[PDB]
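Is sodium ion placement plausible here? Inputs below.
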Amino acid sequence: FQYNYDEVLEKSILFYEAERSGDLPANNRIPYRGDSALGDQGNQGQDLTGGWYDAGDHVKFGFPMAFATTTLAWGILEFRDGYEAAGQYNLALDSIRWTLNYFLKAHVSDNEFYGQVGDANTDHAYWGRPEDMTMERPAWSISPSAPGSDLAAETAAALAAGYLVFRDSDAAFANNLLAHSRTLYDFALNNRGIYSQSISNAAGFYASSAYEDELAWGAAWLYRATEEQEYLDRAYEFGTTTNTAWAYDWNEKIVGYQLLLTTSAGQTDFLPRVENFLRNWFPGGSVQYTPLGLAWLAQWGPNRYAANAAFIALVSAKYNILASESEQFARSQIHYMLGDAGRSYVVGFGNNPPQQPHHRSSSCPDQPAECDWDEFNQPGPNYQILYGALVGGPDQNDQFEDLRSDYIRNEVANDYNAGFQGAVAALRAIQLRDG
Ligand SMILES: [Ca+2]
Ligand code: NA
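Reply from A.M.:
I modeled the complex. Tokens:
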């Protein structure tokens, strides 16, 4: 079946706009959103306003925020023609300019980087508009005494990918991103550790299992950006040619750097593991499929895992790695999400989309009405439409209740849309083909 990818891209970008924290521009397209968290600051009063709220909450979780940005940037680089065909290319640049600017703010000095604003427990205890928050919002950083090679190298990857994206429109901005990428990557190498041990507030939410894959990923991005041999050396030092990724996601960069190195750097040693990942996902592999055709990796965000795999498959296809099966697989997954199994899983799009995403700001009625946990519990649709949000998804039998309190299936998050959006742009690009 066919879907309007131009509309999907427009809406996915609007989802990210609805996640913006800080001082919103005059041209803000999300009418229920206003200025919020203007007090966000470091421990010496450094400005930390901006960035994205992670999910349906108001925490700024730097690790997924950075990974979502690296992934979105990669899709812009590879599938620029799809974004352009859709009229969404400059809106996509404006989308990630938001988080790139936040990463610059968070990098307060060479070897201090702010990785979280908001205490997840006090943040999640509040249900209401971000514009109405009154609780203390602590900020935490990584440093030599409290390292985070994973967070620092992921942010370096986002900044290096950002340099590549932006050097074609705002070269001064792009080259500033590159300078910070180099510095953060050096910090990551010099001060080894797991960021969610150093910023332990993150450990119940975005716990990092290992940092070596982020070291390889940051090096691969900096090699693409600079072509300096020392970065390729670092990629080989930290990268695996013998292990196959379970997922491409905010925690596990393995197939990301393997594919990036094979395609952008021409390093075929990593190619067999890319093929293993793809074939694990394709029908007949290790990932179970629901009866209606979703490749269902796990209970949490199966749409996210499949959309991420579809993204990796479409980058692979672009570079003529298993292109036929990759395109077929990716299209099957994205089209599942768009409506092939009977409903859209994208809020505000297509047939019978979810109306109750687990999301605070869209759950609240129009100002000046009050908003509290009653709006969590109320049995009807969210008062605002969270256009473009890809929800967590159905269970393994394609069941979905569309209940706000079903926080697993009705979850929305920055990382959920990041592979998805690039995959949609890739499918839009494929439509440009002769014939
Ligand atoms: Ca990792
Ligand atoms: Na404003």
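Short version: The first helix runs from residue 5 to 18.
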